[PDB]
Every structure is written in C-alpha cells, then in structure tokens.
Amino acid sequence: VRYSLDPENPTKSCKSRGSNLRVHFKNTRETAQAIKGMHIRKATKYLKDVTLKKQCVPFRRYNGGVGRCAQAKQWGWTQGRWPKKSAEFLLHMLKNAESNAELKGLDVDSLVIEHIQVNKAPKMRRRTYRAHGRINPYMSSPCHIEMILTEKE
RNA sequence: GGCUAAAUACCGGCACGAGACCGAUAGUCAACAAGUACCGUAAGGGAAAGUUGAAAAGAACUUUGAAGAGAGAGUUCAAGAGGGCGUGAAACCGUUAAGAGGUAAACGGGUGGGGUCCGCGCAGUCCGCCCGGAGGAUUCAACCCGGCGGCCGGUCCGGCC
RNA sequence: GAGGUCCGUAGCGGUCCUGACGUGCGAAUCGGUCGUCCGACCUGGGUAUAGGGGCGAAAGACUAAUCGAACCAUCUAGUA
RNA sequence: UGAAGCCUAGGGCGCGGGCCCGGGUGGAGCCGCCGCAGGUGCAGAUCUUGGUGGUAGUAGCAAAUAUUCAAACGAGAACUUUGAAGGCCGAAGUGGAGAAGGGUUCCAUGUGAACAGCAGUUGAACAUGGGUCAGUCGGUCCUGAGAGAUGGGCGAGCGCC
RNA sequence: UAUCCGCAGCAGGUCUCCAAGGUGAACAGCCUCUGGCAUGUUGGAACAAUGUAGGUAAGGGAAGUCGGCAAGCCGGAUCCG
RNA sequence: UUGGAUUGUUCACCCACUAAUAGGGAACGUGAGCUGGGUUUAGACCGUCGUGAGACAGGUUAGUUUUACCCUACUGAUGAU
RNA sequence: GCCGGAAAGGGGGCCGCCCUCUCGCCCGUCACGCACCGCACGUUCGUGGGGAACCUGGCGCUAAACCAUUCGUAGACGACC
Ligand SMILES: [Mg+2]
Ligand SMILES: [Mg+2]
Ligand SMILES: [Mg+2]
Ligand SMILES: [Mg+2]
Ligand SMILES: [Mg+2]
Ligand SMILES: [Mg+2]
Ligand SMILES: [Mg+2]
Ligand SMILES: [Mg+2]
Ligand SMILES: [Mg+2]
Ligand SMILES: [Mg+2]
Ligand SMILES: [Mg+2]
Ligand SMILES: [Mg+2]
Ligand SMILES: [Mg+2]
Ligand SMILES: [Mg+2]
Ligand SMILES: [Mg+2]
Ligand SMILES: [Mg+2]
Ligand SMILES: [Mg+2]
Ligand SMILES: [Mg+2]
Ligand SMILES: [Mg+2]
Ligand SMILES: [Mg+2]
Ligand SMILES: [Mg+2]
Ligand SMILES: [Mg+2]
Ligand SMILES: [Mg+2]
Ligand SMILES: [Mg+2]
Ligand SMILES: [Mg+2]
Ligand SMILES: [Mg+2]
Ligand SMILES: [Mg+2]
Ligand SMILES: [Mg+2]
Ligand SMILES: [Mg+2]
Ligand SMILES: [Mg+2]
Ligand SMILES: [Mg+2]
Ligand SMILES: [Mg+2]
Ligand SMILES: [Mg+2]
Ligand SMILES: [Mg+2]
Ligand SMILES: [Mg+2]
Ligand SMILES: [Mg+2]
Ligand SMILES: [Mg+2]
Ligand SMILES: [Mg+2]
Ligand SMILES: [Mg+2]
Ligand SMILES: [Mg+2]
Ligand SMILES: [Mg+2]
Ligand SMILES: [Mg+2]
Ligand SMILES: [Mg+2]
Ligand SMILES: [Mg+2]
Ligand SMILES: [Mg+2]
Ligand SMILES: [Mg+2]
Ligand SMILES: [Mg+2]
Ligand SMILES: [Mg+2]
Ligand SMILES: [Mg+2]
Ligand SMILES: [Mg+2]
Ligand SMILES: [Mg+2]
Ligand SMILES: [Mg+2]
C-alpha cells in the first residue's frame, strides 16, 4: 500500500507485504537482517537450511540470554539460533514475492532482496495467574513484514 | 367550638423558551443496546464506549497461497479516507542516509571542520543640482475670460448666538 | 466379653523436620513423620442467637479471606 | 486559487515570556486592535486517567512411574482416530450411579478468526439443528425443632409482644 | 486432578450407595481381572556446578550441635522370661 | 597458635596435647550465606509491686528468618582491535 | 665486481666500464626573461600516507579457514584433542 522506501526503478522491482502475523517480532527481525542482501535462490536455500538447523541466524540486537553455537563463526558472531516459524513465514512471503515478479514479467533468477523491514503490530492480550491471587498480562508480539526485490546482475 | 380566596413556596412531574455555561479524561454516573455490562450472600457498588465518504460508489476481474494475507486492476477529488475507516502529536520501534565512538551519557564558553538549505550572489548602489552633445513636443513667462479657495474692510452692509 | 481401655485402618486433626514452596499448585498448599480412632465421637440438611450485640471446655477466640467492637450508605469535601 | 491543527538540517525578530515568514500534510473555519469576563499558563504532589519502554525473547512452561510402531483422513500429525505392543488406576478406584450446586455444558453436523499458557484435522470453543413423556419415582399431604396471623395488650408511629 | 466454590481446565474444598482374585489377622501395603486412562497447561538433545527427593560408605561411634535436630537401631508370629 | 567438659554466650574455668597454645581490625567483618540457643510482639506459670487494669536490666517454657533474571565486583567460557 | 651491517641488520666507501665537459666553483665582460603596473596563504620534505579504479608490458602462482561429519585425552553451550 504505502511502502517505507520506494524502489529506485518501479519496473525492475517487485513488492510483497504481510500484516498481523503471529510470529515473534524479535526473531523475525533478525531473520530478515540475515537475509537482507541475498539473491533469491541463495536466500531460499539458506532459509531451508535454517529450518533444518543446518545454518544459524545470528542474534545481534536481541541477543540477551541467547546461547552460543559453532555456526555463527561464519557470520563473525557468537550467538545464533534457528527460528523455524520465523523462517517459514517469510519463506511463504518470498514465494509470494517471486510469484508477483513473475506476474509482472520479470527475470526470477536475477532477483536480489533490496529492501526488507519488520515492524511491530498491535498486541493481543491473554492472562496468566500468579501467586497470591494476582493477574498479569500474557501479551503477544505480532509483526508486519515488508519486502522489495529487484533485478541486478 | 368551627369555616375561609389573594398576595407566598416548588432541585419531583407534563410541556415549553433561553444562556458572556461544558464541548467526549469536560458536561449528569449515563451524547452510544446506561443505572447497561460487570463484582458482592445481601444492603448496595457500577464502568469503558462519538466522527469513512457528498453519495457505498464498501474494491468486480486476473494472479500466488489451505487461509489469513499480498501483487496488479478499479471507485472516489482524496484509499496519503479500505468497515474501531476525519485530522494523526509525544514516549517507544523498523529501515534509509550522514557523522562519530577505550574514561556512561548529556551540558556551558570559544573556535574549527563537514553537511542541508538560503542569498535566486557571481563583475555590483543610487538620488538631487549643474556643464557639454545629440534628440523629441503645441511649450515657458507675460496678458485675457470663467470657476473655486484663503485672508482682510482702521469703523462696508446684513444676520445669528 | 466390661472399659470416656491399648496397637492400628477409614474418618477427624495438625507435632517435628523450624523439610518443600515462598512474584507458589495455593491470599495457608505439599511430602515424610505424627495425635486420636465406641465416644466429652465425626458429619449433611433444617432451625435459633446480630454488632457495644451474639456465641465462646476462655486463645480477646469466631461472627462470609474483615474483629481489643463486622459490613453498607449517609451526616461528610468531618477536624488537623 | 485552501482556515484551524500537526511536522520541519529552511529565513528571521525579541534580554525573555514568545512571535512572524518559507516548505510539507491537512480539508472549513480563523485572526489583529479598543474595552469586558474568567473553571486562564505545570516537572514534580508514593498526583488522576490512558499509553509505551529497559528488564527480556529473560524467569519460567519439573507434585502423582511411560511410552513405541504402522495405517487412515488431512495442505499440513510428538499430540486426532483405528490396530498392535508395553504400562498405570487396582473394587476405601483414575470404575458404575445420585444429593447440593451449575443451566444446555447433553447429542449430531460443520468451522478452524479468537480461546483451550506448545500444537491441533481435536474441544465443556464458535455456528447450525435436535433432545427431558409417569395414577403406582419425587413434590404436592403430615408434623418436628421453630416460624406466624386474628382476639388482647403495648406503642408518637411504621408497628411490636 | 476439566461441567460445583476458590478471578482459572487452580496439587485446596465439597454429602452418600455398589465393591472381584492372590498374599496376608485384615476394607493395611504389593501384583492381577471387569471397567477406565494416557502421565496431568508442551516436546527434543545432553548428564557441568548449585539444588529437590532418594541410597550406600572403610576405621571410630555424638568427639558434631544450644540441644542425638536429622537419619539410623527395633519391628510380625510361636516358645520361654 | 589445637582437640574437648560446663555455659546462648562474648568472657570465664578446667582436662589433654603442644613448639606455642600471642593480642587485635575489617559498619562491635560476615542473616537476599546459614542457625535461631539469648534478647526482641502476640499464649501461659512463679516471686515481688499495685485496690485494680497491669509492671519488673527477676526466673521459666512455646513461638512464620521473604525476593536475584538487573548493574558492578569475582570465578570460569567464547570472542574482539 | 670488492667489501661496510643483527639490540629494532648498512641506498655507504672502493676497483674496473663503452661514453661524454671543459659545462658545474670564485672573480670579471655581455645582454636576455611575462618589467603582469605597492598588497595574503609564496618557497619544500613529496613520485608523502591511504582508497578506488583506467593501463601497457615482463616474471611468475594456482591456497586455505570455517560450517557439516567423525573422535572423547575435552565438555553446561561455545571452546578443545
Ligand atoms: Mg543487547
Ligand atoms: Mg544475564
Ligand atoms: Mg501460575
Ligand atoms: Mg485464588
Ligand atoms: Mg368564641
Ligand atoms: Mg376563634
Ligand atoms: Mg428573553
Ligand atoms: Mg472521551
Ligand atoms: Mg463522561
Ligand atoms: Mg476518546
Ligand atoms: Mg478529543
Ligand atoms: Mg478522551
Ligand atoms: Mg476517531
Ligand atoms: Mg485528504
Ligand atoms: Mg483523510
Ligand atoms: Mg486515520
Ligand atoms: Mg527514524
Ligand atoms: Mg551508519
Ligand atoms: Mg480408646
Ligand atoms: Mg489409642
Ligand atoms: Mg502449630
Ligand atoms: Mg519451613
Ligand atoms: Mg525459591
Ligand atoms: Mg440483647
Ligand atoms: Mg468448643
Ligand atoms: Mg470502638
Ligand atoms: Mg467535511
Ligand atoms: Mg469558562
Ligand atoms: Mg496541561
Ligand atoms: Mg506532565
Ligand atoms: Mg527460548
Ligand atoms: Mg529459559
Ligand atoms: Mg504440574
Ligand atoms: Mg465415580
Ligand atoms: Mg458415568
Ligand atoms: Mg460433546
Ligand atoms: Mg495455544
Ligand atoms: Mg409476631
Ligand atoms: Mg513423568
Ligand atoms: Mg503427555
Ligand atoms: Mg488437569
Ligand atoms: Mg561408617
Ligand atoms: Mg563398619
Ligand atoms: Mg558435646
Ligand atoms: Mg564443640
Ligand atoms: Mg527424630
Ligand atoms: Mg557485626
Ligand atoms: Mg550480607
Ligand atoms: Mg535473612
Ligand atoms: Mg527462641
Ligand atoms: Mg511472651
Ligand atoms: Mg537461565
């Protein structure tokens, strides 16, 4: 609808969008940061590998308490994880984006992720019961995902 | 032993009219399915909640997906108004760009450097009088005719106060 | 085959570990260990007693998680 | 031919309170001067209401021995259903049935937005429809502990004894 | 141990009926049949410290500690006494 | 620069060993490290005091010890220029 | 070509070379130059350090590290053998 950063060429680019998705915002943002600059096929392969725990997602900003792994050394970090539903949500969105590019009449095997953004969506409340008859929130953190692919060779 | 209208009172009730009043955290608790939802054995306690547009014209149709949800297409002046939709601030977050980074950060004074913009900067003011040179007009002073105005008549005539 | 008799189930209770937990499973729970268990026994329903009053084998205990004077509204925007 | 409001690395003025221009967004009203009036200026009050952070993807999802294989349906299976295997409750039960209480939770079909602190093809969730039959089971009848009128008494009185 | 009350599918609370086989004094504990269930609001990989709940320890035997706290010893039945 | 008997003890005293059984500080070091014996609530008993409710640097017995996942410091483990 | 150097290694001296100058230095003669019209950061070390590319040539070179896997002399996870 209204994209935060428009493409430099509206003809050599395709767009995809999703709102109010029940996936953790902090995990999804790091997955998007991991796949930010990749070719479409490389990104799809990497996302499959993450889902199968063959490659990690390096947790850089939201790293509090995250454990270490040996697979983040190839990212030049120490802490990584494998958020699989985070990976597959934007895998579905990537598939939608490539379908959009094919519909608009583009070269699918030259598309590079040029823009990707994860915003924070309205929270939905549940309730948890604590000691001494107290009630605390059990909130959730849905997110908005917004991505732009473009050709470059 | 007794009766008795008028002038007098009126935050309830049926209708009305008005205001230097309030303007949705205000004004009644209640602008809305409000003494409603809801809590308490009960007596009782008691909310939050307004706004698309002029008009639903409320997004046919193609396409990816199991679907939510997207990409096009279309309506509208405007979707940067898409069914909790007027405007859309701050705290907080994402991304892009620029800069920086071992005494937490921020701050005052003094410069320096770099940016973003502005000056619409880029050969730099005019204004009077006079001298000289080329010009061009119905053209100056004086005189006459008419109109208007300002000051007087040592004490002009007439009014009014 | 007697006993407000003994050991010991169900039930009723709540000693010690000063154990577990202590933003708990829980605004008093959990485990093991314990007391009593034919009697002043345990228990549902009905019924009576109501706040300076009730009821109390008496701890100022209980009276709807509130008790050395309950709760609700009002006097009340009480006084400092 | 664009008011209020809002944003601004744009230009300025004022010692200051503040104010004026430019740009953008917005879509219907607003301001200067002379007087008048006041529910008239917030950083605090363990202030009121609403919203948002760091903590933090952290604490935590450890009471009661236990699951595995194959198939089916399904877009999708650690969790649904069928079969097999291995276990538990162990007749003072994790069995079969009632009273108080609940009030449609009962049964069937369908759905997977929300809820069932993972997930779900399942559900006491949501949507459609169904379902409780009495001379001989109970209430209705009796009276118990007790409650309660009339006559009467007391009482300012509602009324009470 | 999910249709009731406790704010909740809350280890709490809430009145009764029926009651198999073996062992055994026994309605004790333990194993099974009829009936039921899926380990109690999740799973997977490892087996560090510290914990919680269980055990075992040479020689000594309360020297520990305010205090034998905690654990341990004893345990049923028969015959003496 | 110790092992013990008695005491809640600090202090004290005694037995034994020893080479010697010196003295002190760190918020009278150290309770989100423990314990809870003493003091130090609410229950009770005694003596003295008070007419009484009650009092006692007098004795006695029974009595809930909460929270770390934050920053630092420290102990280890990756890594970074 | 010969030597000269290790504490954090010497662009130095010497022996020959094919060549070229009577030029370099000091006094004199001789004229010439953007004489830019009084005016500032002028004059170097400097082919300075660093980063990208345009390049014509010659000489050469076609490696590892990490993940995945395995191991258990190691281990909470990383890490390590
Ligand atoms: Mg961080
Ligand atoms: Mg931490
Ligand atoms: Mg809880
Ligand atoms: Mg509760
Ligand atoms: Mg008379
Ligand atoms: Mg009279
Ligand atoms: Mg009038
Ligand atoms: Mg409002
Ligand atoms: Mg209101
Ligand atoms: Mg409002
Ligand atoms: Mg408003
Ligand atoms: Mg409001
Ligand atoms: Mg609105
Ligand atoms: Mg508009
Ligand atoms: Mg609008
Ligand atoms: Mg809006
Ligand atoms: Mg920003
Ligand atoms: Mg940057
Ligand atoms: Mg007895
Ligand atoms: Mg007995
Ligand atoms: Mg007790
Ligand atoms: Mg305890
Ligand atoms: Mg704890
Ligand atoms: Mg009385
Ligand atoms: Mg009694
Ligand atoms: Mg009183
Ligand atoms: Mg309008
Ligand atoms: Mg006013
Ligand atoms: Mg204000
Ligand atoms: Mg304020
Ligand atoms: Mg996690
Ligand atoms: Mg965790
Ligand atoms: Mg549990
Ligand atoms: Mg049953
Ligand atoms: Mg049944
Ligand atoms: Mg059903
Ligand atoms: Mg769930
Ligand atoms: Mg009566
Ligand atoms: Mg288990
Ligand atoms: Mg299970
Ligand atoms: Mg359960
Ligand atoms: Mg031993
Ligand atoms: Mg032995
Ligand atoms: Mg001793
Ligand atoms: Mg000792
Ligand atoms: Mg003991
Ligand atoms: Mg001290
Ligand atoms: Mg301390
Ligand atoms: Mg403590
Ligand atoms: Mg004590
Ligand atoms: Mg006492
Ligand atoms: Mg942790």
For residue A128, give the nucleotide whose C1' atom is nearest its CA. D117
Helix (H) or strand (E) holding A84: helix A84-104
The CA distances from residue A91 to A18, A122, A142, A153, in Å, are: 12, 23, 17, 23
The resolution of the experimental structure, rounded to one decimal in Å, is 2.8
Strand B reaches within 7 A of the A143 CB: no
Separation of CA A47 and ligand 6 centre (Å): 113
- Greatest C-alpha distance within chain A: 64
Place of tokens 């993450």: A50
From the CA of A143 to the C1' of D109: give the distance in Å.
37
- Whole-angstrom distance between the N-terminal and C-terminal Cα of chain A? 28
Neighbouring C-beta atoms of residue A126, cutoff 10 Å: 8
**What spacing in Å lies between the alpha carbon of A99 and ligand 1's midpoint?**
37
The token duo for A3 is 């994209």
Residue A126: nearest nucleotide (C-alpha to C1'): D117
